[PDB]
Curated annotation (Swiss-Prot):
Origin superkingdom: Eukaryota
Gene from which the chain derives: Comt
Residue span relative to the full protein: 46 to 257 of 264
Extracellular compartment spans: 1-212
Record GO terms (molecular function): catechol O-methyltransferase activity; magnesium ion binding
Upper classification of the organism: Eukaryota, Metazoa, Chordata, Craniata, Vertebrata
Cofactor note text: Binds 1 Mg(2+) ion per subunit.
GO biological process, one term: cellular response to cocaine
Enzyme class of the recorded protein, top EC level: transferase
The protein's name: Catechol O-methyltransferase
Length: 212
């Protein structure tokens, strides 16, 4: 029995099936009252929601799924026919994420890509018929934000206006990524100050819009 299975179980026992909002509130309740967990959370999740509604992306890439909280957060706001692809290298986690998506009724919109982003990113065009990405949610290991950003650009997956949205740019921090995008003329950056999931530690999201 893992913490991730206990979270999935609490959702199955308490959330309304096919109701993504109630799945979200159930994860946040369990992690606020019983076990902290690295979901993006409700405070940063609300900023995510606002960014998603602004840009209405047709194709979203997520780096790091964990238990599916953030994929459920974004997919429930996608237009009909919009797609989310989420890369997760831990097979236990990816199996929890698939079950969470199934319970929320979002299976049709989300495709789990089992593996490490650095291996899966060069296969996006061929194996998933991707031209360019409309939005990227970066929320995996912090030492990969900058390498995977450089890899996305190298593989031709970015276009003018592609929205990169990065979690944890303050805590635990992504200093090289943050320095890179803020100093690069290829990105227009905005910082959204918030709080670490289920805590009052300051954290924030960085939005970095590729400029071509
Ligand atoms: N190189 C990589 N490729 C794919 N997944 C990765 C990765 N490095 C870390 N991960 C995964 O990144 C996840 C970070 S936690 C992600 C939480 C999720 N975005 C949410 O907000 O609910 C972990 O599950 C870890 O296994
Ligand atoms: C098992 C485990 C627990 C905590 C951490 S972590 O690096 O502390 C961390 C904290 C956090 F708030 C986040 O949102 C995170 N998102 C993505 C990856 C790490 C995150 C890594 C692994
Ligand atoms: Mg995070």
């Amino acid at each position: 029995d893992t913490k991730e299975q206990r979270i999935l179980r609490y959702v199955q026992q308490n959330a309304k099936p096919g109701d993504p909002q109630s799945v979200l509130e159930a994860i946040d309740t369990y992690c606020t009252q019983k076990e902290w967990a690295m979901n993006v959370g409700d405070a940063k999740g609300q900023i995510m929601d606002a960014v998603i509604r602004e840009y209405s992306p047709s194709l979203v890439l997520e780096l790091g799924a964990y238990c599916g909280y953030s994929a459920v957060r974004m997919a429930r706001l996608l237009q009909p026919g919009a797609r989310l692809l989420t890369m997760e290298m831990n097979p236990d986690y990816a199996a929890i994420t698939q079950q969470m998506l199934n319970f929320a009724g979002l299976q049709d919109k989300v495709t789990i890509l089992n593996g490490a982003s650095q291996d899966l990113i060069p296969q996006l065009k061929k194996k998933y018929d991707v031209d360019t990405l409309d939005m990227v949610f970066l929320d995996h290991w912090k030492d990969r934000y900058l390498p995977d950003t450089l890899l996305l650009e190298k593989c031709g997956l970015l276009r003018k206006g592609t929205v990169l949205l990065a979690d944890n740019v303050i805590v635990p921090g992504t200093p090289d990524f943050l320095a890179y995008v803020r100093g690069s003329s290829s990105f227009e950056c905005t910082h959204y100050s918030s709080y670490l999931e289920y805590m009052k530690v300051v954290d924030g999201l960085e939005k970095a819009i590729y400029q071509g």
